[PDB]
Design a protein around this motif. Structure first.
Motif, PDB file in Angstrom:
ATOM      1  N   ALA A  92      -4.901  -0.448   5.454  1.00 46.80           N
ATOM      2  CA  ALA A  92      -6.192  -0.010   5.969  1.00 46.80           C
ATOM      3  C   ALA A  92      -7.120   0.315   4.802  1.00 46.80           C
ATOM      4  N   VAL A  93      -8.422   0.250   5.073  1.00 45.78           N
ATOM      5  CA  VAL A  93      -9.476   0.554   4.096  1.00 45.78           C
ATOM      6  C   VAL A  93     -10.193   1.821   4.554  1.00 45.78           C
ATOM      7  N   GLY A  94     -10.204   2.854   3.719  1.00 44.97           N
ATOM      8  CA  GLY A  94     -10.779   4.130   4.111  1.00 44.97           C
ATOM      9  C   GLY A  94     -10.255   4.587   5.451  1.00 44.97           C
ATOM     10  N   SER A  95     -11.170   4.999   6.339  1.00 40.86           N
ATOM     11  CA  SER A  95     -10.802   5.544   7.642  1.00 40.86           C
ATOM     12  C   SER A  95     -10.652   4.438   8.701  1.00 40.86           C
ATOM     13  N   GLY A  96     -10.651   3.189   8.252  1.00 37.24           N
ATOM     14  CA  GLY A  96     -10.584   2.040   9.144  1.00 37.24           C
ATOM     15  C   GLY A  96      -9.239   1.844   9.812  1.00 37.24           C
ATOM     16  N   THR A  97      -9.200   0.948  10.788  1.00 37.58           N
ATOM     17  CA  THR A  97      -7.984   0.697  11.551  1.00 37.58           C
ATOM     18  C   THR A  97      -6.969  -0.072  10.717  1.00 37.58           C
ATOM     19  N   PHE A  98      -5.712   0.264  10.927  1.00 41.44           N
ATOM     20  CA  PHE A  98      -4.620  -0.347  10.190  1.00 41.44           C
ATOM     21  C   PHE A  98      -4.421  -1.763  10.682  1.00 41.44           C
ATOM     22  N   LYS A  99      -4.357  -2.683   9.736  1.00 36.43           N
ATOM     23  CA  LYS A  99      -4.068  -4.088   9.999  1.00 36.43           C
ATOM     24  C   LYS A  99      -2.585  -4.365   9.761  1.00 36.43           C
ATOM     25  N   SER A 100      -1.842  -4.685  10.821  1.00 35.02           N
ATOM     26  CA  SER A 100      -0.437  -5.016  10.661  1.00 35.02           C
ATOM     27  C   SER A 100      -0.337  -6.449  10.167  1.00 35.02           C
ATOM     28  N   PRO A 150     -13.710   4.190  -1.240  1.00 38.32           N
ATOM     29  CA  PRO A 150     -12.816   4.522  -0.129  1.00 38.32           C
ATOM     30  C   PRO A 150     -11.372   4.468  -0.561  1.00 38.32           C
ATOM     31  N   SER A 151     -10.523   5.182   0.168  1.00 37.98           N
ATOM     32  CA  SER A 151      -9.096   5.109  -0.030  1.00 37.98           C
ATOM     33  C   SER A 151      -8.547   3.748   0.398  1.00 37.98           C
ATOM     34  N   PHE A 152      -7.306   3.471   0.012  1.00 40.41           N
ATOM     35  CA  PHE A 152      -6.618   2.276   0.483  1.00 40.41           C
ATOM     36  C   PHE A 152      -5.238   2.672   0.913  1.00 40.41           C
ATOM     37  N   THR A 153      -4.883   2.324   2.138  1.00 41.10           N
ATOM     38  CA  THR A 153      -3.579   2.657   2.683  1.00 41.10           C
ATOM     39  C   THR A 153      -2.709   1.404   2.763  1.00 41.10           C
ATOM     40  N   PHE A 154      -1.453   1.476   2.323  1.00 43.45           N
ATOM     41  CA  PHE A 154      -0.506   0.381   2.569  1.00 43.45           C
ATOM     42  C   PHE A 154       0.700   0.846   3.380  1.00 43.45           C
ATOM     43  N   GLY A 155       1.304  -0.091   4.109  1.00 48.24           N
ATOM     44  CA  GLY A 155       2.397   0.228   5.008  1.00 48.24           C
ATOM     45  C   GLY A 155       3.757   0.075   4.356  1.00 48.24           C
ATOM     46  N   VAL A 156       4.637   1.049   4.616  1.00 45.16           N
ATOM     47  CA  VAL A 156       6.054   0.911   4.323  1.00 45.16           C
ATOM     48  C   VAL A 156       6.767   1.132   5.639  1.00 45.16           C
ATOM     49  N   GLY A 157       7.230   0.052   6.254  1.00 43.51           N
ATOM     50  CA  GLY A 157       7.764   0.158   7.593  1.00 43.51           C
ATOM     51  C   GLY A 157       6.705   0.835   8.444  1.00 43.51           C
TER      52      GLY A 157
END
Length: 330
Positions: free
Chosen positions: A203-211, A260-267
């Motif tokens: 996800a980018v900042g407060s945006g929705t997570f893209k699986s 903006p922040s950047f979020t990545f997924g781990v499981g």
């Protein structure tokens, strides 16, 4: 047995991290770049072409009573950035943070490329990828972790890199006080010799997570976060004035911007990279154009979770019979 050593950024931008390593008897202490993306332990030395040494601390094997020339052995390596080095090989005693390996291959540089010479703060590299990538010929040599594995309380090491501050590499144990919540473990492929895993999206900042599956390597020896062009474009689109610059060699942005922040997924878990971690400062001294910390992996051939990503997490490199990677927030 266990070991624990402090790792320190080499400059104000966290361009890389150095960790003190004791080599030889008596100990010669060198500041090495711990690199989970390569598998050679190599050092500036008394053998390095004089014109190629500029401020680094050298290893002098003739002054170590435990150093032994490994007959006929040579090494030569080229890194993803375009830098390289080469030389001969000794075995000697190597200790990290109280953890000692006897008979470790210490790769002595006879030649280093300009980028190493120009970096006075790095005395060499300590590789922590899989030993299948070791360049020593004609007999491949094992990494420090591989040599220590059997003696460790637990066959693991952990990387806790700091943002503009010191951090920690631990061997043989997990410091449960060093992270928040729980550690999420994820499968590793060793087929390319790397700590290669698959992120579950972003996800980018407060945006929705893209699986979406993003295959990449956990690489402490790479400064930035290199991701697919679609992902990176989505990120920089949220920064007014950001653009990809051919001449600079990547995405740049106005230094007055708030990233903006950047979020990545781990499981099912999520690691959030604060926006400040993605600012690598002016492209040239005095410029108001700043270099971005998230860049496209197109033309690398692989995605790289480098320091920008890893320093947002407590990272477990699990060297069990089937290796895995673990990530926790901190």
């Amino acid at each position: 047995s266990t070991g624990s050593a402090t790792t320190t950024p080499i400059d104000s931008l966290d361009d890389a991290y150095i960790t003190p390593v004791q080599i030889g008897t008596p100990a010669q202490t060198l500041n090495l770049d711990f690199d989970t993306g390569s598998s050679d332990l190599w050092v500036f030395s008394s053998e390095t072409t004089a014109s190629e040494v500029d401020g680094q601390t050298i290893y002098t094997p003739s002054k170590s009573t435990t150093a032994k020339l490994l007959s006929g052995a040579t090494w030569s390596i080229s890194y993803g950035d375009g830098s390289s080095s080469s030389g001969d090989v000794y075995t000697d005693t190597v200790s990290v943070g109280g953890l000692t390996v006897t008979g470790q291959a210490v790769e002595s540089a006879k030649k280093v490329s300009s980028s190493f010479t120009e970096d006075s703060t790095i005395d060499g590299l300590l590789g922590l990828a899989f030993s299948t990538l070791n360049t020593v010929s004609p007999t491949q040599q094992k990494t420090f972790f591989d040599n220590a594995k059997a003696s460790l309380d637990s066959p693991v090491f952990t990387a806790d890199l700091g943002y503009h501050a010191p951090g920690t590499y631990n061997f043989g144990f997990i410091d449960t006080t060093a992270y928040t919540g729980s550690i999420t473990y994820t499968a590793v492929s060793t087929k390319q010799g790397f700590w290669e895993w698959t992120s579950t999206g972003y996800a980018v900042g407060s945006g929705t997570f893209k699986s979406t599956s993003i295959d990449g390597i956990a690489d402490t020896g790479t400064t930035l976060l290199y991701l697919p062009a679609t992902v990176v474009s989505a990120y920089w689109a949220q920064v007014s004035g950001a653009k990809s610059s051919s001449s600079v060699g990547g995405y740049v942005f106005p230094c007055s911007a708030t990233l903006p922040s950047f979020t990545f997924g781990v499981g099912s878990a999520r690691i959030v990279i604060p926006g400040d971690y993605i600012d690598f400062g002016p492209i040239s001294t005095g410029s108001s154009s700043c270099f971005g910390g998230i860049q496209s992996s197109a033309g690398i051939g692989i995605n790289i979770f480098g320091d920008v990503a890893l320093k947002a997490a407590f990272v477990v490199f699990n060297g069990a019979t089937t290796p895995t990677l673990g990530f926790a927030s901190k």
